[PDB]
Each structure stands twice: as structure tokens, then as C-alpha cells.
């Protein structure tokens, strides 16, 4: 990210309490018991950072101040004139926009667009959408229930109010299709690099025993291509090896084929290693059309339906951490054993580097090893 | 009361064997995820609560269920002529057998001879004396979508072995509480008219300290006129008046007692916020929601997932047992006090809970049975 959040001041939100939280540029582990408005704070941040300030028309507040790292100040006030409420979003740059709450309510019931275009023009001419924040809700089981889905945003705004931001989160029943599509697409990518290597190596060939030994070693080196005819041309190459400059060209082509073979599947092998780091006595893999699922040391195969809520939380969180700015995670301790809660932040900090990772947990087991980042929330009741 | 004593699963999913001995009450199973805690709970809910046809969707070898009185149920899945048959053999009773594919076709028909056969088999042997309630660990999904389609919805993504899902969601318990308040208001109004007609008949049929106590105890607005008249042999009937007023007060308390206990249960956990009901100034339509110490009111949608788990767990425990993962989205103090709050409201039944966090099992460490799958 660039404009990291430094300090957010919420005054009289829901007419109950005032809250001012200072954030670092790094990890932000907010620890506090339920009812602290942590979820609200996350929705406020996700409705400020991602340019969706129109959702603030559905929120009851007095004064909301958001300060970034570079020095941009956003002051939001809810003032009503002649029985009609107007939200004033005043930036530190000089410009300020104001709009009626009822106009935004009418626009939302229209979606069931002038103000939407006005908000888009305001955030585009002021460049308020430089950093996009990803929202990980604490109700991802509900996203599994209506199995990224786009109607889930409307369902969650239906039963949690219209202040809720856009919901883009992957279900267990969508990541199976996503993984199958990515594996077949990577196999097709391997086949296209085979055909490009054939045409380029034809042109290059048209223009020692160690090179022959290297070709014999590289002939043996699942990762089989989709176009099996090229696997049969490779079988014929191995059969010919069993039976100068052009040999160097052949060796370079085989080495580039092996390197692209590793590089096409490296992203999914990283995700599989990230999953299998937690899991014990059970491996998630892509044994063979691609089949994706669990494997056991007995050699038995099993569908992804045997997985527990804990393992489902790990799948839905590690896939949505690899496929990534500012990352906001709500309740990562759900249905997890204490050791996985201990190692979850270290695994996600190993896979998500270079971004502002804000997490909100109720269990302190999540915040081991990062106790200096533990910002304790406290509601200052009005 | 045939409480579960010992469950022996042999080669469940053709993976592992498990034999667990259960107490008569408060079976707090503690173990880390992936141990099939939910599995065993579904097995118990498909044995105790009837509905053995779901066992046709399960791959197993031998399942033995022992109750407290001594009833043994042996379920086996045996295939001979390339068709699997489920053999439900009871202790000292008749045994029933059926094809797996026939039961699958019977279930797919709902998408009934075998269903009637299973119902007759479990009815003639009296296997439904004690019913076990299933509290799923995915009750947020029940909030997402009593209700009968929710069972099929959950069986869609958890398999057809999953038992019947009967669990109340938020925004449905609000309707249940409002309906109960409306029913209590109609009950009070009918008891007013019944008390008026009965006291009319009894006064027509027939000390000053008792009259003073009756005047003090007086609190639609006929009681206000009675108190105004009291402020300004035969007197036995006056004693009847005091008794009638006292009986009215007693019925009034009982009318709200069923909901006030649940409100107290809510107010046992919740801090700096009270959940209560109020009536309108014009139509007396009940609103149920929060009451802040500032006097401000708010709907039940401001409540957090934690408080919603507390709402869904304190309700349907009073309306009475297998609970799956009661530690979800809960504070450590709430995990400490949840079993202590629920044991007063759920006493007298076998309460089986399965938790991943040992904080739930504080104060009941003698009941902590650690599950361990013995892989074949």
C-alpha cells in the first residue's frame, strides 16, 4: 500500500460511544471482546478506503475523521436541515462533497445513478481509490450457505443493513472450480509453450558428451501436458536418446521446457504447501481432466466435503490470501485449534508481505509473537 | 430415560474405529478439529432421534449403540450381490434389512413404503422414548437462509447422512417472542373477563388490616377505581376480592415469567445493554430489542455475531442433547460461563457438547473425554 491508515476517530457512532484507534503501517492486531463494535470499525474502514462512502448514508454518527500516512484527512459529518439528513465528506485537499441520505436510499432502491456518478467523480478527481482494502467477513459460513459470489453482497446487506461493504469472498464450493480451472489453464499454457518452443527451436536449429548426458538427464524430467501428442514427441526424443550447436539448442529448449513446467504449477504448489503446512496425516493435491481433492497415506482419495469447518476456514482464508493494499480480516480464530491459531498469523505473514494487514481477533492465541502490534480497543461511552 | 452409555463405531468411512463411553449427563468431548466430532454427533442424532434411513448414505462396517437401560442397536452395511444392505438388528428384538439403493430412491422421491416400514419398525420396538436435539456448528448458515427446507439445504452441502435440522435463526426468534407476548396479552385479557364474571357470580352468591393490604396490593383501569374507592358476614366476600386481586397478580407474573427467564438469561451474559420488550403508546404492539443505560433503544440487528450465538444458544435450550462447537465467536469469559448458565436451563437431559477450546470445559474437567481416531 501507499496511504496507510494512521489514526481513525469515530465520534458518537450509533449514539453510544466514541472511539479513536491509531494504526501502524504494519500489522494491526486488534484484540477485544464482542460488542466492542470491532465489526463496525472494519466496515467503516472498508467503506472509507475503497471509495464507497455512499454506504455512510445508512450509518448514524456525529463525526468521523480518517487520517492516512501521507497526511490526507477525511472528515465526515451527518447534519440534518429541514428534517433531511446530509452527509458532508470534507477532504483535507480543499474539495468537499455533500449529499442527502434519502437520495442515496432512493438510489439503492433503484438498484433493487446520478449520485453514484457524483461519488465516482469525487473519488476519481481526488484520487481516493489509490489503495483498495479487502474485507474478510466473520460470517463466511453464510457465504458458504449461498454458494466470488455477487448476490452474497445483497444478502448480507439485506440482513446486516446497507452500510455493509461489497462482499468478495470465495466459498469452499467455488474454490474447487477455481482450482480445476487454474490447473487446466496452466496445462494449456504448458502446451502453448511447447508449440512456441517447437517453432522457435525450428528457427534456431535452422540458424560434446556432457550435452548428451544433460539431454539424457533432462529427458526423464502430474505435470504431463494436456496435448499428449507433444508428450509423445518427447517420448520419441527419449527413445532416440536411448538409441554440437544444435545439441546446445536442444539442451536449452529442454531446460526452458522444464523451467516453464515448474513455473506454470509453482503458484498452485505454493498454495498446496501453504495448505499442507497446517494439515497433518492428510494431503490436499491434484492427482489425475484434473481432479482436485484430499489424499491419505493409505492411498485412498476423498472429496472436499469431508473437511471440517476449521479446515474450511483455512481453505477459504489461504486462498483469499494468496489471491491478493490493505487487508482487513474479521475473526480468524473461528473453529480452530489453539496451535493453528498460534501459527496462522505467521503463515499468513509469510504469504502476504508488503501490505497493511489489519486483523481483529477475540482470542489472544492469534496474537502470539506480535504483542507490540496488539492494539486494545476500549469504548469510551458518551 | 435411555441415556447414551457407550458408542462403538467400527471402520467408519472405512477409515477408523472409535469407542466412547458416555456419562449420564454433561458429556464434554474435547479434541482438535478433523477428529470427526460432527460425524459422531450426526451418528448419535441418527440413532437416538430415529431416522435410520440416513445410514444408507453412510459407508461403515459395524455401529453399536448402547443406551443406559441396556438396549443395544447394531447397524451393519453388508454387500453380497453387488448391492449394499443395511441391517438394523436390535437387542432381543426383530431385525430389519433394506437395500441402500431403494432408500436412495425413496429419498430422491421427495426431491414411501420403506419409510413406513422403518417407522413401523421403530414404533413397534419403542425406540423413540428419548429424543436428542442437534445443535449444528453451522448455525450461521441457518441465519443466512420450524423450517423444513433448511434440513435439505444443509444436506445439500454436507451430504445426505446429515440429520434433520431444527434450529431457530435470528429474526425468527424475534417473531416467536412477539407472538408469545401477543399470546400472553390475549391470555391476560381473557383472564380479566373470566375473573370479572366469576367474581361477579361469587359476590352475588355471598378485619380492616386485610382490607388495607388489599388496597395496597391493588395495581383495564378497574383496579385504579377500586383503589380510589378503597382509599375513601358480608366482608368475607371482601376477602374474596383480595384473593381475586392476588390471583390476578399471580397470573400476570406467570404470563411474563416464561419470557422473563429468557430475558434474564440474556441479561446474565450481556453487559452495558439490556434486552427487553416495550409496548407502544397507541396500539400496544410489542417491540423487542436493546435498552441502553442511556435509555436509547435499538433493533436486534446491531448485535454482534457473539451476542447472536448467545441468543441462539440460550433460546432453544429453554424450549426443550447434542451441541456442536459452542465456542464460536465467543469471549473467554463467555466460554467460561456458558456451560454454567446452560446447565440450570437444560438440566434433566443428556447434554453432549463437542468443543475445540478447553475454556468451555472449565469446572467440569472430570467430564472431559478426549476423542482419538484409531485409524485401521
XYZ file of C-alpha atoms in Angstrom:
758
model
C 0.000 0.000 0.000
C 0.894 3.701 -0.123
C -1.516 5.691 2.081
C -1.594 3.544 5.193
C -4.113 4.399 7.905
C -2.536 6.259 10.830
C -5.427 7.287 13.123
C -9.223 6.966 12.875
C -11.538 8.955 15.172
C -15.214 7.925 15.380
C -17.425 10.238 17.439
C -20.796 9.007 18.796
C -21.289 6.129 16.368
C -24.754 4.562 16.910
C -25.130 7.254 19.656
C -23.336 5.062 22.207
C -19.599 5.699 22.439
C -16.564 7.446 20.983
C -13.558 5.502 19.715
C -10.157 6.640 18.464
C -7.729 3.977 17.247
C -4.218 4.663 15.971
C -2.904 2.193 13.392
C 0.649 1.395 12.400
C 1.822 0.986 8.820
C 2.478 -2.707 9.578
C 0.308 -5.426 11.213
C -2.605 -4.230 13.354
C -3.894 -6.939 15.707
C -6.999 -5.535 17.405
C -7.964 -7.711 20.376
C -11.239 -7.208 22.211
C -14.409 -8.919 23.335
C -17.647 -8.972 21.332
C -19.909 -5.941 21.409
C -16.935 -3.569 21.070
C -18.026 -2.508 17.595
C -14.938 -4.101 16.014
C -17.076 -5.282 13.081
C -18.482 -1.757 12.722
C -14.939 -0.304 12.742
C -13.945 -2.754 9.994
C -16.981 -1.803 7.897
C -16.187 1.896 8.427
C -12.600 1.363 7.246
C -13.743 -0.718 4.261
C -16.309 1.965 3.366
C -13.679 4.724 3.610
C -10.650 3.187 1.891
C -12.392 1.576 -1.090
C -14.231 4.769 -2.137
C -17.687 3.518 -1.081
C -18.631 6.484 1.079
C -22.295 6.310 -0.001
C -22.836 3.483 2.484
C -22.262 6.072 5.206
C -25.704 7.464 4.386
C -27.055 4.341 6.132
C -24.970 4.982 9.269
C -25.856 7.058 12.336
C -22.851 9.054 13.527
C -21.682 12.525 14.525
C -18.108 12.998 13.282
C -15.749 10.532 11.595
C -12.127 11.511 10.999
C -9.738 9.335 8.984
C -6.042 10.206 8.713
C -3.739 8.440 6.275
C 0.054 8.151 6.470
C 0.793 10.833 3.870
C -1.425 13.360 5.641
C -4.797 13.186 3.916
C -7.617 13.936 6.357
C -11.219 12.908 5.700
C -13.926 14.402 7.921
C -17.446 13.014 7.592
C -20.348 14.695 9.341
C -24.058 13.895 9.453
C -26.063 17.136 9.667
C -29.794 17.446 9.083
C -31.588 20.512 7.736
C -35.414 20.728 7.447
C -35.924 17.099 8.577
C -33.487 15.845 5.884
C -30.031 14.470 6.677
C -26.989 15.412 4.594
C -23.603 13.691 4.831
C -20.630 16.041 4.349
C -17.422 14.292 3.235
C -14.779 17.033 3.562
C -11.261 16.134 2.455
C -8.077 17.894 3.553
C -7.267 18.805 -0.073
C -9.870 21.589 -0.171
C -12.707 19.889 -2.019
C -15.746 18.584 -0.157
C -18.901 16.777 -1.245
C -22.275 16.752 0.490
C -25.382 14.743 -0.308
C -28.799 13.815 1.040
C -29.336 10.491 2.810
C -32.747 9.988 1.177
C -31.248 10.414 -2.295
C -28.846 7.546 -1.559
C -31.731 5.460 -0.180
C -33.706 6.111 -3.377
C -30.651 5.154 -5.457
C -30.283 1.894 -3.502
C -33.966 1.109 -4.005
C -33.394 1.887 -7.699
C -30.794 -0.912 -7.776
C -33.461 -3.240 -6.306
C -27.463 6.743 -10.682
C -26.648 10.453 -10.625
C -25.419 10.298 -7.023
C -23.325 7.211 -7.835
C -21.722 9.082 -10.743
C -21.163 12.080 -8.446
C -19.427 9.877 -5.854
C -17.337 8.238 -8.599
C -16.358 11.655 -9.986
C -15.487 12.879 -6.477
C -13.267 9.887 -5.701
C -11.714 9.961 -9.185
C -10.841 13.669 -9.308
C -9.405 13.500 -5.771
C -7.764 10.056 -6.300
C -9.269 8.431 -3.224
C -9.082 4.898 -4.676
C -5.294 4.551 -4.787
C -5.284 1.771 -2.174
C -8.035 -0.854 -2.194
C -8.863 -2.673 1.036
C -10.028 -6.286 1.011
C -12.710 -7.261 3.529
C -12.784 -10.704 5.149
C -16.109 -11.035 6.995
C -16.672 -13.001 10.172
C -19.749 -14.644 8.598
C -18.042 -16.554 5.771
C -20.163 -19.599 6.624
C -23.085 -17.545 5.293
C -21.074 -17.120 2.098
C -20.774 -20.902 2.041
C -24.560 -21.031 2.563
C -25.404 -19.060 -0.602
C -22.740 -20.783 -2.691
C -16.656 -14.854 -5.898
C -20.432 -14.655 -5.491
C -22.072 -11.292 -6.157
C -25.563 -11.857 -4.736
C -23.945 -12.535 -1.348
C -23.320 -8.795 -1.020
C -27.041 -8.113 -1.432
C -27.931 -10.911 1.019
C -25.531 -9.570 3.647
C -26.731 -6.011 3.134
C -30.304 -7.312 3.424
C -29.718 -8.881 6.835
C -26.916 -6.651 8.210
C -28.036 -3.261 6.886
C -26.972 -1.309 3.828
C -23.820 0.065 5.479
C -22.100 -3.277 4.742
C -19.423 -3.017 2.008
C -19.054 -5.112 -1.142
C -18.595 -8.793 -0.299
C -15.980 -10.551 -2.462
C -15.026 -13.771 -0.695
C -14.547 -17.310 -2.021
C -16.648 -20.235 -0.820
C -15.403 -23.837 -0.495
C -17.783 -24.735 -3.329
C -16.276 -22.117 -5.670
C -12.558 -22.636 -4.993
C -12.865 -26.238 -6.226
C -13.993 -24.926 -9.621
C -11.385 -22.155 -9.476
C -8.577 -24.637 -8.760
C -9.741 -27.001 -11.520
C -9.904 -24.100 -13.989
C -6.447 -22.860 -12.993
C -4.854 -26.317 -13.285
C -6.345 -26.943 -16.741
C -5.385 -23.415 -17.845
C -1.818 -23.986 -16.641
C -1.702 -27.281 -18.563
C -2.887 -25.450 -21.686
C -0.205 -22.832 -21.017
C 2.390 -25.614 -20.942
C 1.055 -26.867 -24.287
C 1.337 -23.379 -25.786
C 4.908 -23.042 -24.567
C 5.592 -26.424 -26.178
C 4.340 -25.192 -29.550
C 6.209 -21.875 -29.241
C 9.359 -23.774 -28.238
C 8.926 -26.037 -31.274
C 8.628 -23.112 -33.701
C 11.474 -21.145 -32.100
C 13.739 -24.185 -31.852
C 12.992 -24.993 -35.501
C 14.123 -21.485 -36.460
C 17.159 -21.675 -34.150
C 18.266 -25.110 -35.389
C 17.876 -23.734 -38.920
C 20.099 -20.837 -37.685
C 30.297 -32.835 -26.505
C 29.253 -35.853 -24.454
C 28.306 -33.666 -21.483
C 25.492 -32.077 -23.504
C 24.237 -35.546 -24.475
C 24.371 -36.630 -20.819
C 22.456 -33.486 -19.819
C 19.859 -34.207 -22.517
C 19.560 -37.776 -21.213
C 19.044 -36.466 -17.686
C 16.517 -33.867 -18.852
C 14.597 -36.419 -20.943
C 13.116 -38.117 -17.870
C 12.140 -34.782 -16.302
C 1.273 -34.943 -12.516
C 2.933 -32.376 -14.788
C 2.078 -34.089 -18.071
C 0.738 -31.755 -20.727
C -2.838 -31.686 -21.956
C -1.729 -32.164 -25.575
C -0.365 -35.693 -25.171
C 0.989 -35.737 -28.742
C 3.749 -33.403 -27.576
C 4.325 -35.817 -24.684
C 4.722 -38.474 -27.373
C 7.188 -36.358 -29.300
C 9.082 -36.108 -26.000
C 8.791 -39.895 -25.678
C 10.312 -40.194 -29.152
C 13.121 -37.844 -28.067
C 13.789 -40.079 -25.050
C 13.717 -43.157 -27.310
C 16.229 -41.513 -29.660
C 18.443 -40.665 -26.687
C 18.191 -44.330 -25.664
C 19.231 -45.407 -29.174
C 27.145 -29.532 -31.479
C 25.413 -26.166 -31.750
C 22.097 -27.873 -32.486
C 22.594 -30.109 -29.441
C 23.155 -26.942 -27.386
C 19.896 -25.540 -28.822
C 18.123 -28.802 -27.906
C 19.516 -28.665 -24.360
C 18.413 -25.035 -23.976
C 14.935 -25.897 -25.278
C 14.621 -28.814 -22.844
C 15.827 -26.629 -19.963
C 13.331 -23.898 -20.872
C 10.564 -26.513 -21.125
C 11.452 -27.776 -17.638
C 11.622 -24.232 -16.232
C 8.228 -23.300 -17.673
C 6.895 -26.650 -16.420
C 7.900 -25.675 -12.891
C 6.783 -22.044 -13.277
C 3.261 -22.869 -14.515
C 2.474 -25.005 -11.452
C 4.556 -23.071 -8.890
C 1.658 -20.811 -7.797
C -0.580 -23.755 -7.035
C 2.264 -25.749 -5.498
C 2.823 -22.773 -3.176
C -0.870 -22.759 -2.268
C -0.818 -26.542 -1.721
C 2.260 -26.260 0.506
C 0.555 -23.441 2.423
C -2.497 -25.660 2.979
C -0.494 -28.813 3.816
C 1.643 -26.885 6.327
C -1.221 -26.934 8.836
C -2.892 -30.246 7.905
C -1.388 -33.435 9.326
C -1.866 -37.045 8.099
C -3.843 -35.692 5.114
C -2.583 -34.085 1.893
C -4.536 -31.825 -0.456
C -3.376 -32.431 -4.019
C -4.222 -32.536 -7.721
C -3.747 -36.194 -8.736
C -5.234 -37.342 -12.039
C -9.171 -33.999 -16.666
C -7.738 -32.596 -13.421
C -9.101 -33.938 -10.140
C -8.528 -31.778 -7.045
C -9.049 -33.177 -3.578
C -7.734 -34.897 -0.493
C -5.327 -37.829 -0.315
C -4.393 -40.157 2.531
C -1.220 -42.157 3.314
C -3.296 -45.303 2.679
C -3.634 -44.179 -0.957
C -7.375 -43.529 -0.699
C -8.889 -40.468 -2.364
C -11.716 -38.403 -0.917
C -13.884 -35.393 -1.858
C -13.549 -31.925 -0.318
C -16.806 -32.498 1.598
C -15.161 -34.454 4.445
C -13.333 -31.276 5.542
C -14.240 -29.690 8.881
C -15.237 -26.041 9.449
C -11.667 -25.448 10.697
C -10.087 -26.783 7.542
C -12.779 -24.925 5.570
C -11.738 -21.685 7.278
C -8.120 -22.420 6.383
C -9.057 -23.126 2.758
C -11.190 -20.002 2.390
C -8.605 -17.809 4.094
C -5.418 -19.151 2.487
C -6.965 -18.998 -0.990
C -8.146 -15.452 -0.362
C -4.716 -14.517 0.980
C -2.766 -15.964 -1.956
C -5.147 -14.310 -4.452
C -4.376 -10.755 -3.401
C -3.001 -2.763 -0.410
C -4.828 -3.127 2.926
C -6.223 -6.469 4.132
C -8.909 -6.468 6.843
C -9.620 -9.833 8.492
C -12.503 -10.258 10.941
C -12.307 -13.176 13.439
C -9.629 -15.585 12.123
C -9.888 -17.778 15.245
C -13.212 -19.367 14.264
C -13.364 -23.161 14.781
C -9.583 -23.500 15.033
C -7.404 -25.429 17.446
C -5.035 -23.323 19.578
C -1.809 -24.342 17.777
C -3.232 -23.345 14.387
C -4.381 -20.083 15.973
C -0.787 -19.650 17.160
C 0.745 -20.254 13.727
C -1.937 -18.721 11.471
C -0.596 -15.159 11.558
C 2.966 -16.361 10.940
C 1.804 -18.369 7.923
C -0.250 -15.509 6.541
C 2.534 -13.009 7.175
C 4.812 -15.356 5.265
C 2.381 -15.447 2.339
C 1.138 -11.809 2.472
C 4.122 -9.454 2.640
C 4.176 -5.811 1.621
C 0.646 -4.832 2.685
C -1.100 -3.431 5.759
C -2.582 -6.491 7.477
C -5.262 -5.489 9.996
C -6.749 -8.428 11.910
C -9.450 -8.393 14.587
C -9.486 -11.383 16.928
C -11.303 -12.257 20.146
C -8.812 -14.979 21.144
C -5.306 -13.799 22.136
C -3.773 -17.041 20.752
C -3.807 -15.345 17.339
C -1.542 -12.523 18.558
C 1.440 -14.591 19.737
C 4.811 -13.239 18.615
C 3.340 -9.832 17.650
C 2.479 -8.438 21.070
C 3.789 -4.963 20.184
C 1.119 -4.774 17.453
C -1.719 -5.605 19.886
C -3.945 -2.518 19.936
C -6.573 -2.936 22.654
C -9.961 -1.450 21.794
C -11.922 0.354 24.529
C -15.353 2.001 24.074
C -15.473 5.498 25.584
C -19.208 5.745 26.308
C -20.598 9.264 25.664
C -34.717 -42.073 30.231
C -32.417 -44.121 27.986
C -29.254 -42.043 28.103
C -26.351 -42.969 25.833
C -23.758 -45.075 27.668
C -21.255 -46.321 25.062
C -20.958 -45.857 21.291
C -18.731 -48.194 19.261
C -18.068 -47.339 15.601
C -16.132 -49.962 13.639
C -14.480 -48.897 10.347
C -16.483 -45.692 9.936
C -15.866 -44.291 6.412
C -13.599 -47.392 6.132
C -11.033 -45.268 7.984
C -11.022 -45.692 11.758
C -12.563 -47.307 14.831
C -13.835 -45.312 17.811
C -15.321 -46.438 21.134
C -16.504 -43.730 23.541
C -18.078 -44.281 26.960
C -20.542 -41.541 27.897
C -21.778 -40.327 31.257
C -25.455 -39.842 32.060
C -25.101 -36.055 31.773
C -22.686 -33.379 30.505
C -20.503 -35.268 28.044
C -17.923 -32.591 27.212
C -15.866 -34.055 24.371
C -12.697 -32.031 23.806
C -10.464 -32.615 20.810
C -8.852 -30.824 17.925
C -10.562 -30.413 14.540
C -10.556 -33.133 11.897
C -11.379 -35.784 14.528
C -14.900 -36.215 13.112
C -16.616 -34.705 16.161
C -19.530 -33.600 13.970
C -19.584 -37.097 12.383
C -20.087 -38.885 15.726
C -22.720 -36.269 16.632
C -24.621 -36.963 13.387
C -24.360 -40.704 14.085
C -25.855 -40.237 17.562
C -28.589 -37.944 16.193
C -29.372 -40.542 13.522
C -29.563 -43.300 16.155
C -31.299 -41.676 19.140
C -33.770 -39.461 17.247
C -34.799 -42.234 14.851
C -34.470 -41.698 11.078
C -32.157 -44.610 10.296
C -32.606 -44.176 6.522
C -29.754 -41.651 6.534
C -27.458 -44.577 7.341
C -27.984 -45.747 3.766
C -25.855 -42.752 2.722
C -23.024 -43.793 5.068
C -20.137 -46.199 4.449
C -19.439 -48.267 7.561
C -18.915 -51.804 8.852
C -20.471 -52.105 12.322
C -22.109 -49.488 14.550
C -23.171 -50.440 18.078
C -25.231 -48.105 20.265
C -25.776 -48.849 23.962
C -28.353 -46.958 25.999
C -28.475 -46.659 29.793
C -31.222 -49.250 30.291
C -29.388 -51.841 28.200
C -30.848 -51.537 24.712
C -28.274 -52.429 22.049
C -28.623 -51.350 18.412
C -26.305 -52.934 15.831
C -26.209 -51.445 12.331
C -24.211 -53.125 9.584
C -23.623 -52.308 5.917
C -23.093 -55.578 4.048
C -22.952 -56.139 0.294
C -23.134 -59.573 -1.311
C -24.800 -59.424 -4.742
C -23.199 -56.046 -5.654
C -25.916 -54.235 -3.629
C -25.342 -52.897 -0.131
C -27.909 -53.813 2.521
C -28.367 -52.064 5.858
C -29.115 -54.475 8.716
C -30.644 -52.778 11.775
C -30.554 -55.521 14.438
C -31.929 -54.535 17.841
C -31.190 -56.246 21.142
C -33.734 -59.031 21.945
C -35.960 -57.806 19.115
C -36.605 -58.256 15.428
C -34.078 -57.095 12.839
C -34.895 -55.156 9.681
C -32.864 -55.086 6.476
C -33.139 -52.928 3.383
C -31.323 -52.107 0.167
C -29.235 -48.933 0.041
C -30.393 -48.061 -3.485
C -34.053 -48.483 -2.525
C -33.560 -45.998 0.320
C -31.745 -43.631 -2.055
C -34.691 -43.853 -4.466
C -37.084 -43.220 -1.556
C -35.115 -40.100 -0.582
C -34.910 -38.985 -4.234
C -38.705 -39.335 -4.486
C -39.002 -36.430 -2.029
C -36.801 -34.321 -4.338
C -42.810 -44.246 0.874
C -43.191 -47.955 1.613
C -39.672 -48.218 3.054
C -40.263 -45.078 5.144
C -43.449 -46.626 6.552
C -41.549 -49.876 7.190
C -38.814 -48.021 9.104
C -41.436 -46.045 11.062
C -43.325 -49.248 11.931
C -40.053 -50.927 12.956
C -39.046 -48.077 15.272
C -42.624 -47.700 16.580
C -43.277 -51.353 17.454
C -39.952 -51.547 19.340
C -40.383 -48.135 21.091
C -37.035 -46.668 20.056
C -38.180 -43.021 20.330
C -38.600 -42.703 24.097
C -35.837 -40.075 24.396
C -35.277 -37.585 21.572
C -31.873 -35.942 21.172
C -31.664 -32.372 19.890
C -28.938 -31.462 17.407
C -27.285 -28.048 17.564
C -25.155 -27.641 14.415
C -21.840 -25.830 14.262
C -23.017 -24.012 11.110
C -25.986 -22.176 12.641
C -24.825 -19.015 10.871
C -25.914 -20.788 7.674
C -29.321 -21.199 9.303
C -29.256 -17.455 9.915
C -28.305 -16.995 6.249
C -31.319 -18.807 4.807
C -39.611 -24.897 12.448
C -38.299 -24.525 8.901
C -38.197 -27.772 6.924
C -36.265 -26.797 3.787
C -33.229 -25.915 5.924
C -32.568 -29.624 6.503
C -32.395 -30.282 2.755
C -30.325 -27.111 2.274
C -27.752 -28.289 4.821
C -27.835 -31.855 3.467
C -27.019 -30.438 0.026
C -23.561 -29.290 1.144
C -22.911 -31.764 3.985
C -24.240 -34.961 2.416
C -27.453 -36.886 2.900
C -26.214 -38.600 6.075
C -26.899 -35.302 7.874
C -29.893 -35.500 10.268
C -32.972 -33.280 10.435
C -32.068 -29.648 11.116
C -34.438 -27.978 13.599
C -32.774 -24.802 14.866
C -34.113 -21.244 15.223
C -32.336 -18.365 13.472
C -32.260 -14.698 14.480
C -35.119 -12.578 13.041
C -37.256 -15.707 13.619
C -36.939 -15.800 17.403
C -37.969 -12.127 17.308
C -41.229 -13.216 15.672
C -41.564 -16.061 18.188
C -41.066 -13.689 21.138
C -43.513 -11.135 19.709
C -46.062 -13.906 19.117
C -45.598 -15.130 22.699
C -46.063 -11.594 24.070
C -49.228 -11.221 21.961
C -50.491 -14.579 23.250
C -49.760 -13.529 26.834
C -51.654 -10.258 26.307
C -54.674 -12.164 24.977
C -54.388 -14.575 27.910
C -54.335 -11.718 30.430
C -57.350 -10.050 28.772
C -59.351 -13.284 28.777
C -58.378 -13.919 32.397
C -59.604 -10.392 33.205
C -63.015 -11.095 31.710
C -63.158 -14.572 33.291
C -62.158 -13.155 36.695
C -64.747 -10.369 36.400
C -67.564 -12.791 35.536
C -66.515 -15.310 38.202
C -66.111 -12.675 40.916
C -69.477 -11.199 39.904
C -71.105 -14.617 40.369
C -69.266 -15.291 43.650
C -70.064 -11.882 45.169
C -73.698 -12.418 44.136
C -73.538 -15.784 45.916
C -72.075 -14.227 49.077
C -60.555 -7.409 59.519
C -59.520 -3.925 58.420
C -55.874 -4.965 58.054
C -56.831 -7.351 55.237
C -58.744 -4.529 53.524
C -55.719 -2.230 53.910
C -53.472 -4.934 52.428
C -55.931 -5.377 49.546
C -55.856 -1.616 48.944
C -52.055 -1.634 48.988
C -51.836 -4.642 46.662
C -54.094 -3.019 44.044
C -52.142 -2.092 40.912
C -58.311 -2.393 32.283
C -58.254 0.511 34.753
C -60.875 -1.007 37.078
C -58.154 -1.572 39.689
C -57.474 2.182 39.813
C -61.149 2.831 40.591
C -61.067 0.028 43.179
C -58.024 1.638 44.826
C -59.776 5.026 44.763
C -62.860 3.503 46.409
C -60.705 1.695 48.989
C -58.919 4.968 49.783
C -62.254 6.658 50.554
C -70.629 -11.847 57.298
C -70.572 -9.777 54.102
C -66.874 -8.877 54.492
C -65.885 -12.472 53.667
C -66.700 -11.565 50.063
C -64.338 -8.609 50.504
C -61.674 -11.189 51.390
C -62.584 -12.861 48.084
C -61.856 -9.517 46.385
C -58.349 -9.527 47.847
C -57.845 -13.121 46.746
C -59.119 -12.283 43.277
C -56.718 -9.362 43.005
C -53.896 -11.518 44.326
C -54.799 -14.265 41.876
C -54.822 -11.700 39.078
C -51.353 -10.562 40.086
C -50.133 -14.150 40.241
C -51.435 -14.914 36.766
C -49.863 -11.709 35.484
C -46.454 -12.800 36.757
C -46.746 -16.241 35.211
C -47.768 -14.674 31.902
C -44.441 -12.947 31.539
C -42.341 -15.452 33.522
C -41.731 -17.725 30.526
C -40.179 -14.882 28.605
C -38.613 -13.048 31.562
C -36.428 -16.038 32.426
C -35.047 -15.977 28.896
C -34.592 -12.219 29.195
C -32.742 -12.771 32.462
C -30.671 -15.423 30.701
C -29.791 -12.834 28.076
C -29.161 -10.237 30.760
C -26.941 -12.784 32.506
C -24.386 -12.622 29.681
C -24.878 -9.148 28.148
C -23.158 -6.201 29.819
C -23.967 -2.467 29.484
C -27.065 -3.396 27.412
C -30.371 -4.980 28.443
C -32.582 -6.943 26.064
C -36.233 -6.250 26.805
C -39.693 -5.607 25.395
C -41.818 -2.451 25.394
C -45.351 -1.618 24.296
C -46.455 1.234 22.061
C -48.365 4.211 23.432
C -51.222 3.888 20.905
C -51.592 0.271 19.747
C -49.546 -1.587 22.441
C -47.685 -3.507 19.735
C -44.632 -5.121 21.375
C -41.130 -4.116 20.326
C -38.317 -6.432 21.437
C -34.764 -5.141 21.384
C -31.939 -3.499 23.248
C -32.227 -0.912 26.014
C -29.021 1.006 26.627
C -28.358 2.543 30.078
C -28.765 5.943 28.373
C -32.377 4.950 27.629
C -31.857 4.673 23.874
C -33.421 1.744 22.029
C -32.020 -0.165 19.071
C -33.122 -3.096 16.870
C -31.707 -6.612 17.205
C -29.565 -6.101 14.086
C -26.893 -4.072 15.923
C -25.986 -7.214 17.906
C -22.657 -8.871 17.151
C -22.180 -12.470 15.966
C -21.098 -13.336 19.531
C -24.268 -11.988 21.071
C -26.202 -13.665 18.237
C -24.644 -17.017 19.177
C -25.671 -16.316 22.767
C -29.201 -15.509 21.555
C -29.436 -18.710 19.512
C -27.945 -20.810 22.305
C -29.982 -19.528 25.251
C -33.088 -19.833 23.136
C -33.985 -23.422 22.095
C -32.304 -24.636 25.300
C -35.219 -23.289 27.307
C -37.522 -24.652 24.578
C -36.642 -28.262 25.339
C -28.942 -33.056 23.518
C -26.109 -32.665 21.000
C -24.366 -29.286 20.753
C -21.598 -28.844 18.175
C -18.972 -26.103 18.753
C -20.470 -23.726 21.355
C -17.236 -21.687 21.487
C -17.793 -19.957 18.134
C -17.100 -16.185 18.177
C -17.232 -16.056 21.968
C -15.295 -14.148 24.601
C -13.129 -16.151 27.018
C -15.375 -15.160 29.943
C -18.429 -16.204 27.935
C -16.704 -19.523 27.213
C -16.112 -19.833 30.959
C -19.737 -19.131 31.884
C -21.720 -20.693 29.003
C -21.981 -24.216 30.440
C -22.732 -22.867 33.918
C -25.556 -20.735 32.516
C -26.938 -23.543 30.353
C -26.846 -26.322 32.964
C -29.561 -24.607 35.013
C -31.851 -24.258 31.987
C -31.151 -27.648 30.370
C -30.961 -29.856 33.497
C -32.503 -33.317 33.343
C -31.276 -34.356 29.891
C -28.069 -35.780 28.428
C -26.132 -32.695 27.303
C -23.346 -33.693 24.904
C -21.069 -30.849 23.784
C -18.035 -31.026 21.491
C -15.565 -28.158 21.796
C -12.148 -27.376 20.335
C -11.246 -24.853 23.046
C -10.771 -26.221 26.591
C -12.161 -22.945 28.029
C -15.666 -24.394 27.642
C -14.811 -27.304 29.963
C -13.688 -25.279 32.991
C -15.133 -26.598 36.239
C -16.167 -29.893 34.580
C -12.752 -31.417 33.927
C -13.848 -34.876 35.104
C -16.262 -34.975 32.142
C -13.597 -34.076 29.551
C -13.376 -37.152 27.315
C -10.638 -36.730 24.703
C -11.559 -38.237 21.337
C -8.900 -40.106 19.336
C -9.488 -41.845 15.971
C -7.827 -45.270 15.846
C -7.084 -45.495 12.121
C -7.446 -49.103 10.856
